[PDB]
Every structure is written in structure tokens, then in C-alpha cells.
Design a binder for this molecule. Structure first.
Ligand SMILES: Cc1nc(Nc2ncc(C(=O)Nc3c(C)cccc3Cl)s2)cc(N2CCN(CCO)CC2)n1
Length: 278
């Protein structure tokens, strides 16, 4: 019985499929076939991600779970289990009540989610990233649409399908697939080179999304002209009401040369300080 500890095929992350109830579907977006559910064993609400026929290879789908088994942080969406073996595989995690950060910012009560709270959301995320950096992991998909919101303005980084444990300071992707131009660092766009610093650059973009309450980066700018603009030293302007110190932090994140970009440890301490000033 693989499900038994005595078994040689035992896996602590494998959970009894009949231990979960599939309620309302949450999909509608791009995360995939995401469902809301309940882990009866504890009547604990949970999020469930499913896999289909063609859609994606099983080795590709489980990649995200493999990554999530090695990271643990209050600001990183936590893995609760997986359902392999039979058809439709599942990936179960804690459930974030308010959905993705991007839509949250666009639908929120701006009087409640104010300057301090926005500041509190940036600090939490930089916290999760300081942990990933410290363990030499890269996320490669940092964006407001990939963060999740819980009660009390709790924010957690999600979507680890492209995350990787690095052996060095860099990771070179292959040449196939593409990457979100407006969130991707120059060296990643030009040479497909990723690193913690490329995550730092994306964090800067995420800050701008937060400061604008969900505006799309480089509004109105054609995607084919983004890179060359960035090469001519163009950078998004300071959002209305955005503190200059916070904006100066965005600019440091967008330094053309990776080594000129701050570390996530410096970024988090910088935000922790500003936030404590409350
Ligand atoms: C699509 C969606 N996700 C929600 N919560 C989530 N929590 C965790 C999720 C998840 O994807 N985990 C996960 C990860 C991160 C990686 C691998 C595998 C998995 Cl399974 S998704 C809530 C939600 N809504 C409730 C709030 N409504 C607005 C006001 O009530 C709108 C609808 N909608």
C-alpha cells in the first residue's frame, strides 16, 4: 500500500484523493484548472490545481510541486499535497481567500488599502524573495497577477512552475518559449540569462503595479519598442502618490547592469524600515 508508511512507494506529499471535496471552480484566469475545495480530515478549505489530456505533460505539471516541496515561508503559497497515480492529477495548497493581487488592487477599497497597506504588501513580498534569494532560488515569474491575497492584506507569492534551484549565480533558459516582456530584465530579454537580479528587476515592476493599483506596465507602449527604450535609459515614471523613497527603490531595481541592482536583503530591510515608520 503506497499510502502506507511501511510501503516502499510511500510519499508524504501524496494525499488521499477522497480526502478532498471539489466545490466551486475558480479558473476563469490562466493559473489553470483551479478549484476551491475542502480537506475533510480537518474541514480546511484548500486550493486545487488540475491537469488535462493534452494541455501539458505530467513531468511539466509536477515540476511546480517538486519546487514547492523544498521551500517554506509564510509569504510563499504553501504546498499541502499532490494527487498522482490515477487520471486528473491534483496539486493542493492553502487557499487564498481574495485571489490574485492584480485584480485585488483593481477592485479594492482604496481608502482601506492605502499607502501604509500598499507599503505592507511590498514588504511581505520582499520578505518571501529574501528567503528565496538566500536559498539560491529564482522565481522567474514575479508579477502582481502571480501573487495571492488572504485576509488582513496577507500577501503570498505563487506560481512556481518556472522556479529553479541554481547551482551558481546564473541560469540560462533554452530558446523555445518566451517570457513577459514588460516584467523581464534586459539581459533576460537579450541573452535569456536569469538570476536573482532578474527577479529583482521584476520585483521593481511589481512595485509599480502595486503603487498604481493594478495599472499595466508601460501603458500604451508597443512591446517591440520596450527593450530599445530601456536601452536608451527610459523607465516608468513615479506613480501618483508614490513616496519618492519607494520610487528610488524601483529605479535601483531597474538598473541596466544586474550588479548595480540591490539585493533582496537590502530591499526588504529598506521596506521594513519604511514600514516600521508606522
Ligand atoms: C483563481 C482564484 N484563486 C483563489 N485562491 C487561490 N489560493 C491558492 C491558489 C493556488 O492556485 N494555489 C496553487 C499554487 C499557488 C501553485 C500550485 C498549485 C496551486 Cl493549487 S488560487 C481565490 C479566488 N477567488 C476568491 C476571491 N474572489 C473575489 C472576492 O471574493 C474571486 C475568486 N480565485
Amino acid at each position: 500500500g503506497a499510502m502506507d508508511p511501511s510501503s516502499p512507494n510511500y510519499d508524504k506529499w501524496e494525499m488521499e484523493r477522497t480526502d478532498i471535496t471539489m466545490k466551486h471552480k475558480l479558473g476563469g484566469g490562466q493559473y489553470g484548472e483551479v478549484y476551491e475545495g475542502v480537506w475533510k480530515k480537518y474541514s480546511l478549505t484548500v486550493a486545487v490545481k488540475t491537469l488535462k489530456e493534452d494541455t501539458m505533460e505530467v513531468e511539466e505539471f509536477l515540476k511546480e510541486a517538486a519546487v514547492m516541496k523544498e521551500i517554506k515561508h509564510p509569504n510563499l503559497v504553501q504546498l499541502l499535497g499532490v494527487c498522482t497515480r490515477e487520471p486528473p492529477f491534483y496539486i493542493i495548497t492553502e487557499f487564498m481567500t481574495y485571489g490574485n493581487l492584480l485584480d485585488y488592487l483593481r477592485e479594492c477599497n482604496r481608502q482601506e488599502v492605502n499607502a501604509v497597506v500598499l507599503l505592507y504588501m511590498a514588504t511581505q513580498i520582499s520578505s518571501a524573495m529574501e528567503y528565496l534569494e538566500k536559498k539560491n532560488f529564482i522565481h522567474r515569474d514575479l508579477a502582481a497577477r502571480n501573487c495571492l491575497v488572504g485576509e488582513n492584506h496577507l500577501v503570498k507569492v505563487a506560481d512556481f512552475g518556472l522556479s529553479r534551484l541554481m547551482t551558481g549565480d546564473t541560469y540560462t533558459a533554452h530558446a523555445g518559449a518566451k517570457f513577459p516582456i514588460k516584467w523581464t530584465a534586459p539581459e533576460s530579454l537579450a541573452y535569456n540569462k536569469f538570476s536573482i537580479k532578474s527577479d529583482v528587476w521584476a520585483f521593481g515592476v511589481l512595485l509599480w503595479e502595486i503603487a498604481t493599483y493594478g495599472m499595466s506596465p508601460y501603458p500604451g507602449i508597443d512591446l517591440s519598442q520596450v527593450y530599445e527604450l530601456l536601452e536608451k535609459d527610459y523607465r516608468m515614471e513615479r506613480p501618483e502618490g508614490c513616496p519618492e523613497k519607494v520610487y528610488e527603490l524601483m529605479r535601483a531595481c531597474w538598473q541596466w547592469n544586474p550588479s548595480d541592482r540591490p539585493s533582496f536583503a537590502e530591499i526588504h530591510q529598506a521596506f521594513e524600515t519604511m514600514f516600521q515608520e508606522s
